[PDB]
Amino acid sequence: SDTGLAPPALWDLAADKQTLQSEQPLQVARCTKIINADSEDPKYIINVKQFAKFVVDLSDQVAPTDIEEGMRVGVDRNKYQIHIPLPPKIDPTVTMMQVEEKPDVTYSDVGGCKEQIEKLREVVETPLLHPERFVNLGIEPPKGVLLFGPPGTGKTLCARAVANRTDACFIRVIGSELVQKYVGEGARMVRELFEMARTKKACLIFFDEIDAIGGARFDDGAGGDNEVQRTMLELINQLDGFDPRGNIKVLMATNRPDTLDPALMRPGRLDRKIEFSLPDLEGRTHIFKIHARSMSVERDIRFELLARLCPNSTGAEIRSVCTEAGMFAIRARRKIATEKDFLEAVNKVIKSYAKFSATPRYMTYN
Amino acid sequence: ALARELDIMEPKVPDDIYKTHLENNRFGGSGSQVDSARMNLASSFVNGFVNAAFGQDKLLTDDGNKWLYKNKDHGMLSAAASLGMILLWDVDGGLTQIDKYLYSSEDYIKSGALLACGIVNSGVRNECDPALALLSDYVLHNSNTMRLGSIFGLGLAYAGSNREDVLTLLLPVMGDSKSSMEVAGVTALACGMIAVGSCNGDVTSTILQTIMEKSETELKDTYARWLPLGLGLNHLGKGEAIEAILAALEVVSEPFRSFANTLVDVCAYAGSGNVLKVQQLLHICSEHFDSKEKEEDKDKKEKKDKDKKEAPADMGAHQGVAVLGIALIAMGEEIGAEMALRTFGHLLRYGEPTLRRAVPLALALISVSNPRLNILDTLSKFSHDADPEVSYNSIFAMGMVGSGTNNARLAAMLRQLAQYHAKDPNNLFMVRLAQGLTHLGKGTLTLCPYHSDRQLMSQVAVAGLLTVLVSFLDVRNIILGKSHYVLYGLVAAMQ
Amino acid sequence: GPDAASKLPLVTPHTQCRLKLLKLERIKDYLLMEEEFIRNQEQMKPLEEKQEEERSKVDDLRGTPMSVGTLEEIIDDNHAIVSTSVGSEHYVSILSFVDKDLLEPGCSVLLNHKVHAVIGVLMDDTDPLVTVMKVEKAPQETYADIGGLDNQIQEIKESVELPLTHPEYYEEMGIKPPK
Amino acid sequence: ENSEKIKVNKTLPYLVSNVIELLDVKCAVIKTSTRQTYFLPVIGLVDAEKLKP
Ligand SMILES: Nc1ncnc2c1ncn2[C@@H]1O[C@H](COP(=O)(O)OP(=O)(O)OP(=O)(O)O)[C@@H](O)[C@H]1O
Ligand SMILES: [Mg+2]
Ligand SMILES: [Mg+2]
């Protein structure tokens, strides 16, 4: 035991006779890759993994059109005859980037970004859904969006939210995964990504934190960063590169917009740029509501006053006030918060921790 | 009013976007559109239900003439019923304009429309009770076809009604063998569920109408199973003092009397949690039939074991299912015993992944050896989590579509019409109360679709009759509303 | 996955309340019927023993020199591509004897040594990285030993220890614990 | 002869190899795609001049 013991009732359901009926009649094949289709009628050239490059034709049941150059196909283990086409090989590290479970956040937990949300839905949530509206006019909808702003403003939330409603496949990318040891295979992960996406009629790619692989072209004469630069070029070439990119709609959010190559920031690749500025008064008065809902309150709380006590407070700094104001109630042993509790919260998360912060040194985007 | 107007957001949900997320199927064909009615008919069923309660969210109705031309002559008869589902719970809104166009040709198309009437008229329980007045005339009219549609709708519309006039009135129509068998057979199921009390006069009369049948019809019928079901629920709670007459008077009958008598016992003994009564069912019954040619009885024996075991203090549920897998499938008979797949979903059907579905049922869903076996399990999954409002369900559904029996058309519509239909939102299917121990007597109607799909003679596989797979839905709503006399409105939270 | 112990931790009565007794007797009746339910059917149908016959046939279907390889991809169920020992990829056929659940893309697979196929998954050796940072128990330093810092011990207690011992507090005010 | 000639070719599976040195002491030395070298004394069913190293 401890290896593969499955539900014993399922073994008999496995029909051991059929298994014997399958552990003999079903010949085990070996993966291969086709290089040429030598003409005459059959005469396919083959390349097994690490045995040799043999010459094979067919068995009986694979239609000639079923096989094409550079297609994965299984072969006989004795006479080396093609029997079944095989899927192309996608790097497992690139195939794990596909999101299988939608994040549990919708387009109602981001507040104050009304204009940003609307401008982020006509390029990633309308060209795909209701795709006939644009047909009755000459419009290729913009393909690509850059979300930039100070840290803790909501760049990822508006992206994590879009994945909650999008019907097309959503592909992750962190911007640090595209950094790999050997020269070369940092562009393979950027070539395989789009090959997988093109296999999906509608696909979205979220190049989160595109600053580790999206730097500016810099030649110091001392062999500065080059592998990252090469990877960025492949990304730039696969968005408008003498080959229709397909239906892929990129979506990359950067913490440092003033660092990107002046070729990843032109229409065609990163078409529309959406600015995520610090919330205004009406904004942060709404962020407080969206984060203080599922909590006990005095009901009669001047949330507007609290909003105006933290003028340049990022969205994160507002949740920390709400998540900390109730903290002052857990300590007093009370179960219902109070405005005085929140005021002490603002005095700690906004004016007491302002020594470190991130907003003052980032709104210059440097 | 408070869902669309007050709420700022109001997006639309076209069917095409989510119909095929996996694009492997479309690859290679490159279009190749075909006029096959089998493909078209199944797709309409899925789309129609999702569009319910969407007055302005209709796009395939204004120009639906083209869809009518792309099918067979007899295909539209089954599709004609689906039109009514769109206008759900329309007492008079949809009927105002239909009457003016009634004086027209194409009377054949009218047959399918009536099937929709029964579903829409079910649950309203109007004091005037217009359903008989608006359905009795055509039933009595001399025509097998036009009254054929009326038979199904009448039973469902009067689930809460228990008037004896209708039950006796319907008996002669089914008792007339000069008409089609299906006409009488389909009706017999409807009448059984209407009466939940005793109904002594008709229960015995119904038995008589089954007794005076030839051996070939009685033996090889494939349709007599539903007969005890109506009687079984019509005799629930009866003791030995009542069944004594039935047993004593049923001692000069054919051996089939034992086949039917089995169902009554369980229904009467609603709560009878014990071991002595259950044991002879599995062992004594199984051994005795091995020496004779009689069959098709052990399957019903196992499915009814759910009774008096639904709520074992939330502790006997897990234990019961485990025994079934290692008992009814581990060494059971090759076909009949192995066909105890719809029992697991019957015991508890609300949606509870990772503990009761992936292991018990998901494993057997990939039985590619025999497509027929997958038929029972493919439909079994949809029943227990049809509307669970769980976002973590679609991953498993895509685990088989496009990777299994795709070339075969018979297995094609098994998964597409059911697996992709489990995305219906704002709907709940659990019928147990908050306590979870007090069941609803009339809410237990979700038991008929547990053996009909197995045989499939003009039932599922054969086109012409598919409303059987639409009538068993009887559940409550999942929406909770709060309001005041002057429409004040509160925002009180819940946990 | 499943837990061998804790069949029903219903200690809510926490006393001599009769409710404890009713549930226990329920299993006893079910056990009694199962006893003669298995042995009885095990005589006139001597096909599968389920204790010695069940294991025996699968072993023959397996091979004495069971192979070890890496599963590289998951083609349609009952079929997969497993990387051979050294460098070859085989389009093997998955046998139902495997749990069919632990087949993660790249963990491990046991294959027959002649007709190579999937015979069984293998648990993955604890990677050295896990053992590197898996601190077992703080040797001696207690929490009253630290001394001095008092107002600063409450913050750590209230962020990394309270939400795991008394979640109710960050359970009724609907506030997630400080990250 | 053609029936026998096809019999060797009828074994369609070939082993691709690259000619290394077309020695004239009209022989050939090949390097099969398995890291094995050989000294085919007779070139085979191909011209001795159409084969270049
Ligand atoms: N407008 C907003 N409304 C509500 N919550 C917000 C808003 N903006 C930010 N947040 C809060 O920010 C947190 C997550 O921040 P997020 O990672 O999206 O910010 P960011 O600035 O895009 O990130 P980074 O630059 O670190 O990648 C969440 O807890 C979320 O509640
Ligand atoms: Mg981010
Ligand atoms: Mg631009």
Side-chain angles (χ1 to χ4, degrees), chain A residues 109-113 149-158 160 208-209 253-255 279 286-287 290-291 314-316 319:
Chain A
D109 311 5
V110 314
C113 307
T153 322
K155 284 152 300 173
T156 288
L157 201 64
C158 272
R160 182 145 58 122
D208 193 8
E209 248 174 11
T254 192
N255 154 195
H286 191 267
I287 293 193
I290 189 43
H291 271 304
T314 49
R319 195 230 49 181

Side-chain angles (χ1 to χ4, degrees), chain A residues 57-70:
Chain A
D57 39 14
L58 257 205
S59 64
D60 73 344
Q61 38 199 1
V62 202
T65 188
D66 198 356
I67 292 311
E68 305 92 71
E69 283 68 329

Side-chain angles (χ1 to χ4, degrees), chain A residues 3-4 6 8 10-11 14 16 19 23 26 28-31 49-50 72 87 294-296 319 322-323 326-327 329-331 333 335, chain C residues 50 57 61-62 73 81 87-91 93 95-99 112 115-116 121 154 158 169-170 172-176 178-179:
Chain A
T3 89
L10 163 154
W11 309 343
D16 300 26
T19 86
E23 273 238 355
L26 197 131
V28 306
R30 292 191 22 68
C31 310
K49 192 35 157 164
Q50 277 191 298
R72 295 232 303 181
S294 66
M295 314 73 195
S296 287
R319 195 230 49 181
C322 311
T323 185
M327 222 47 177
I330 262 53
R331 249 217 298 291
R333 268 273 48 63
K335 289 144 33 199
Chain C
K50 182 41 55 199
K57 46 238 178 187
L61 198 299
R62 284 186 165 172
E73 169 244 304
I81 286 90
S88 39
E89 303 52 37
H90 301 38
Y91 183 42
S93 167
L95 271 306
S96 314
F97 332 118
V98 306
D99 62 70
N112 177 355
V115 190
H116 310 191
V121 153
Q154 208 189 11
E158 145 170 347
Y169 304 97
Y170 334 105
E172 94 281 24
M173 314 216 333
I175 22 63
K176 288 342 316 173
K179 289 287 303 329

Side-chain angles (χ1 to χ4, degrees), chain B residues 275 279 290 315 323 330, chain C residues 23 29 33-34 36 45 48:
Chain B
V275 287
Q279 272 282 248
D290 275 358
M315 96 153 177
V323 173
Chain C
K23 23 181 179 292
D29 294 359
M33 63 57 40
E34 267 252 18
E36 92 266 30
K45 267 109 176 180
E48 31 183 349

